[PDB]
Amino acid sequence: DISRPVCILGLGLIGGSLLRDLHAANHSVFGYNRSRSGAKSAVDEGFDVSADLEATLQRAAAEDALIVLAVPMTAIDSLLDAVHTHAPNNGFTDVVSVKTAVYDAVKARNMQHRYVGSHPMAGTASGWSASMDGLFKRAVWVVTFDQLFDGTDINSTWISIWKDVVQMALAVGAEVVPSRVGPHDAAAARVSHLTHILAETLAIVGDNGGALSLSLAAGSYRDSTRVAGTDPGLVRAMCESNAGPLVKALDEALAILHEAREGLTAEQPNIEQLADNGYRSRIRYEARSGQSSRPVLRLHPGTPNWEKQLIHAETLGARIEVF
Amino acid sequence: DISRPVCILGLGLIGGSLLRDLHAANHSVFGYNRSRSGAKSAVDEGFDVSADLEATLQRAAAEDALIVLAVPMTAIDSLLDAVHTHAPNNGFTDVVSVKTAVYDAVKARNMQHRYVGSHPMAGTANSGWSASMDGLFKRAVWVVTFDQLFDGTDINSTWISIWKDVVQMALAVGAEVVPSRVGPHDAAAARVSHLTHILAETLAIVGDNGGALSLSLAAGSYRDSTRVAGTDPGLVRAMCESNAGPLVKALDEALAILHEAREGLTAEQPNIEQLADNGYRSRIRYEASRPVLRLHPGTPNWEKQLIHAETLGARIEVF
Q1: Considering only CA atoms, which of A175, A183, A111, A121 is closest in space to residue A147?
Q2: What is the CATH number of the domain that holds B271?
């Protein structure tokens, strides 16, 4: 279980849902919502919430709480600065879709000895009314571990923060997948950010078709343009934060689409390669989900060479369980 | 309702489902399936299905039945030859996802005087008779063609009666009938269905190129946007290859947007304002249903109202 009380900063879809699940699971937890209304609402429903950021961090520091920065990327720096200044010895984690940008921000402030990156594959970062129960059940929750393999010189206290973050993610039914920042952003660029870019693109090309096109659109179109409904502010945050790895991903998309075009413009139009490859890839994805077959490695923090199992899990996309 | 009994050639998702609804609605209906096994299954469930193509057409000839070609585009060219030889007087339609190729195949064989093209947006499936279902067309769109009124073509009251029964059949099984010519249809289908497939196959591969971790981290958005990549490649090829010209027009717009986005992400200060905004705004329009137009075939300039429905993407009902 979790050796520290959890302190959630920001109580929206992610943070609120985390507070609720942790409370359900009966673990010590409290949090902060900027909204005076939202705080009052949660306190009245039974939760331990405040709208006083200074007071929350003072207490967080007093109880050595694990601090969860459950805010959007644009809010991270101010919350890092707030934590650095009010709970400089506390351990802490974030929930943002992109990881390199955050780790960098943490390193620039010399907070890497107290930080463990994390990213739930939950929904779209909406305030407190967005919070629900069991959001994370059987959902992937990435937990980082760069400090173990880069130029950071960490000791046992960091290992202790890392454990609580994993115990926390596991406490709310998540599947913890360990990853360093580069491999993660490389993945998210492909499976989430490009997903969003293609979704916007499709909506425009369809809209360009006018009345008949929007009328004839069916289930496939509904599904492929759904995430184009998410907020422009967020879609930009994701993609811009991770522009580097996204461009590598988008370039693969353009190469494939160019090859596809070469094929459709031939004397005999042909897209075998795109079709056989696409199908096969989609089958591989379904195979390790539903119509969850992720492998599972058991780490034993403390034991020699356990760290190498984190890289082994990263390469395999294995979820982990710590004994 | 429908004046003629229905004859369904090919009984998979589309044709098989069309049979079940017309049978449930207690309308006169019978069909054909190449698969001898698939025909036995149907007969063993109480349906009027045969494996003998020639005999099915001779029966369709003796009932003046409406012939529905519910087969893939690759089986069309020989089926037209078959209907020509064994049932020339019969009025027929089809359900293929591309409408130009079929109409050319029809004209090539001088059959357009008894042909009314159509396309139900009912999707596809990796199966035959076993994929059939009740209520497949409820609320879904059913496109019906009418190029014969605007290209050079001498038509009589029969064609109109054939067109009337195709619309009513569509309506009978709970579909919304949007009329359209082959050019506009294929342009639209290129944009909202075929490009959709192309983009899904692409995303699936890019994600797979990322290896174990990428696939493991893929969540809801990926799942939804790569769903059609799971449809059998053969169907995807047929669908896109048959509509190659229009699809390229659509793909080129996609590529324009995607490059302009890459310009955006490579800047000193990465920026995809434009894409996100236009994208989001395009989706909001889509969500917010189709307009309607009353039509009486025969009355002067009723065909003008078909063009109106086409521009509007409106569904029609017949008075």
Answers
A1: A111
A2: 1.10.3660.10
Look up residue A101 and give its two tokens.
Answer: 């940008």
Which residues from A are below 8 Å from B276, CB to CB?
Answer: 200, 232, 235-236
Kindly state whether residues A286 and A300 are assigned to the same domain.
no
Nearest one of A31, A65, A63, A67 to A49, comparing CA atoms: A31
How far is Cα A75 from Cα A94, in angstroms, rounded to an integer?
11
For residue B221, the enclosing domain spans 182-288
Query: How far apart, in whole angstroms, are the C-alpha atoms of residue A148 and residue A144?
Result: 10
Residues in B 130-169 with any Cβ partner in A closer than 8 A: 140-141, 143
**Residue of B89, B133, B92, B118 whose CA lies nearest to B9:** B92
A229 in contact with B at a CB cutoff of 8 Å?
yes
Cβ separation A140–B219 shorter than 8 A: yes
What is the spatial distance between Cα B317 and Cα B167, in angstroms, rounded to a whole number? Answer: 8
Question: In angstroms, rounded to a whole number, what is the distance separating the alpha carbons of residues A103 and A29?
Answer: 25
DSSP string, B178-218: EE--HHHHHHHHIIIIIHHHHHHHHHHHHHHHT-HHHHHH-
Chain breaks in chain A (C to N over 2.5 A) after: 125, 291
Q: Which residue of B has its CA nearest to A200?
A: B279
Resolution (A): 2.6
3-state secondary structure at position B167: helix
Question: Are B54 and B11 part of one and the same domain?
Answer: yes
H/E element holding A143?
strand A140-143
* Cβ–Cβ contact A111 with B under 8 A: no
Amino acid at A253: A
Identify whether residues A194 and A222 lie together within a single domain.
yes
Contact B262 A284 (CB under 8 A): no
Interface touch B283/A316, C-beta < 8 Å: no
Contact B214 A187 (CB under 8 A): yes
Inform me whether the C-beta atom of residue A272 falls under 8 Å from chain B C-beta atoms.
yes
Same domain, B318 and B174: yes
Relative to beta strand B29-32, strand B6-9 is parallel
A13 at interface of B, judged by CB pairs closer than 8 A:
no
DSSP letter string over B114-138?
A: SB--EEE-----S-SGGG--SSTTS
Burial class (CB in 10 A: 0-12, 13-18, 19+), B238: buried
Q: Are B265 and A237 in contact (CB under 8 A)?
A: no
Q: Are residues B177 and B218 in the same domain?
A: no
CB B309 within 8 A of CB B293: yes
Q: At what angle do helices B244-266 and B233-242 cross, to 10 degrees?
A: 100
Nearest Cα to Cα of residue A10 among A2, A1, A19: A19
Check B257 against A204: CB less than 8 A apart: yes
Say if A311 is an interface residue toward chain B (CB within 8 Å). Answer: no
Say which amino acid occupies B253.
E
Q: By the 8 A CB rule, do A73 and A96 touch? A: yes
| Total domain count, chain A | 2
